[PDB]
């Protein structure tokens, strides 16, 4: 059926315009009677509509809560149609997606959403491509009491955020959680994976998390051990 | 605006129940109300148009209705693909509105969180500034109070909490409440201590380095 396929940068810096493109296949956005949308939805929340273009003519509707920052156009050849939020701050950060209002039949002017494009998570903020540094999460005692224990890494301090962590180059799959990234008041996202493991394995079995950043071509392997109380050792 | 207001903030449902998720609007709305799924990362799905007219291929599970200013989308034999959100949304005109939404997820028994405490590295105690992460482990369901006291009495900021996805294979899942310190703050007290409140357990749990001593 039809597709909408939307492209564009996924930073976009303190006040700058941030440009969006959808991509229409298998349709006409010269076609009568259907309207070309843009909706955002924060982190969690629910969805909010912002604008859209009329198919057959430029004609555009406007969320009044954005009137003066946004402008939405069609691109009549091309089967394009864009946006434009000028003048981004904190509170822009959102996926982005694009979608496609048709009539509903029973009503004149009743235009209900039919179909989306996968959506583009843009964050708005400073920072240039960042590795991250990597610190071992690992109790300071051997837990002995409890028959399983936990160990993890922190993932902090980097921009854009794919980063990827895997244990023992893979073949740790089992326990295994990695939380979502969290952009701190610096501009920069931390993470954590941890696993939980036998505690008889600990001192016989090693464990290693594996980080990339593909962004800024960083790969890390960070080896967790029981805490010293000074300092540790390799 | 008209406000669309859908009542369940979330709820646990096991596969085969009849889920009843609603919405509300804040001014009659005729029958202009759609009604969407939407699984994490994907785009949305329409699912019910008009107030009762189901898209072509939704199964027929989905069951729209209501008129005016109060809606309901009815969930009856609820597959294991039916848990996503699902999110209302009034098309009278500009500006189009939405739903807050509700989380339809998977209910299964009781866990505790198993609670460990992180503390920081000297690598990280180099920088100047450390994180000490408490952890949440494979529990359910999700409200779980994470106090921080340090040394005695409590830290009130400084702690971003995160929170896992249920677990693709037990439903359960996990919270991380990291405390975030200057290094020179961090060295100047002793016990640190998350305690965690959550209801599988019959009282608060507290995990603790002295580090007055490591």
């Known amino acids: 059926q039809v597709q909408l396929q939307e492209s564009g940068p996924g930073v976009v810096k303190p006040s700058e315009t941030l440009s969006l493109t959808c991509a229409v296949s298998?349709?006409?956005?010269?076609?009568?009677?259907?309207?070309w949308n843009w909706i955002r939805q924060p982190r969690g929340k629910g969805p909010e509509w912002i604008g859209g273009?009329?198919?057959?003519?430029?004609?555009?509707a406007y969320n009044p809560s954005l009137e003066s920052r946004v402008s939405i156009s069609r691109d009549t050849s091309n089967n394009r149609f864009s946006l434009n939020l000028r003048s981004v701050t904190a509170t822009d950060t959102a996926t982005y997606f694009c979608?496609?209002?048709?009539?509903?039949?029973?009503?004149?002017?009743?235009?209900?959403?039919?179909?989306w494009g996968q959506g583009l998570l843009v964050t708005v903020s400073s920072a240039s491509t960042k590795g991250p540094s990597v610190f071992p999460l690992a109790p300071s005692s051997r837990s002995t009491s409890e028959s399983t224990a936990a160990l993890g890494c922190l993932v902090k301090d980097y921009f854009p955020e794919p980063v990827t962590v895997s244990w023992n180059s893979g073949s740790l799959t089992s326990g295994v959680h990695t939380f979502p990234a969290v952009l701190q008041s610096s501009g920069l996202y931390s993470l954590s994976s941890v696993v939980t493991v036998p505690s008889s394995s600990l001192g016989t079995q090693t464990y290693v998390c594996n980080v990339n950043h593909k962004p800024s071509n960083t790969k890390v392997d960070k080896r967790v051990e029981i805490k010293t109380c000074g300092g540790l050792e390799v | 605006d008209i406000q669309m207001t859908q009542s369940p903030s979330s709820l646990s449902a096991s596969v085969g129940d009849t889920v009843t998720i609603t919405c509300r609007a804040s001014?009659?709305?005729?029958?202009?109300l759609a009604w969407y799924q939407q699984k994490p990362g994907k785009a949305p799905k329409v699912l019910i148009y008009?107030?009762?007219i189901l898209q072509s291929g939704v199964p027929s599970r989905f069951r729209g209705s209501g008129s005016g200013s109060d809606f309901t989308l009815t969930i009856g034999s609820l597959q294991i693909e039916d848990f996503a959100t699902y999110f209302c949304?009034?098309?009278?005109?500009?500006?189009?509105?939405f739903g807050g939404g509700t989380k339809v997820e998977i209910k299964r028994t009781v866990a505790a969180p198993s609670v460990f405490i992180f503390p920081p590295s000297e690598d990280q105690v180099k920088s100047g500034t450390v994180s000490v992460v408490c952890l949440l482990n494979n529990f359910y369901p999700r409200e779980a109070s994470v106090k921080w006291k340090v040394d005695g009495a409590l830290k009130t900021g400084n702690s971003q909490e995160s929170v896992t996805e249920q677990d693709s294979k037990d439903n359960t899942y996990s919270l991380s409440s990291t405390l975030t310190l200057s290094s020179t703050e961090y060295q100047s007290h002793k016990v640190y201590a998350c305690e965690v409140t959550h209801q599988g357990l019959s009282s608060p749990v507290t995990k603790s380095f002295n580090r007055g001593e490591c």
């Open positions: 949304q009034q098309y009278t005109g500009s500006p189009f509105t």
């Open positions: 001014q009659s709305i005729s029958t202009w």
């Open positions: 008009s107030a009762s």
């Open positions: 979608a496609r209002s048709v009539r509903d039949s029973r009503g004149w002017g009743r235009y209900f959403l039919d179909t």
């Open positions: 298998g349709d006409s956005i010269k076609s009568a009677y259907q309207y």
């Open positions: 273009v009329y198919s057959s003519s430029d004609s555009t």
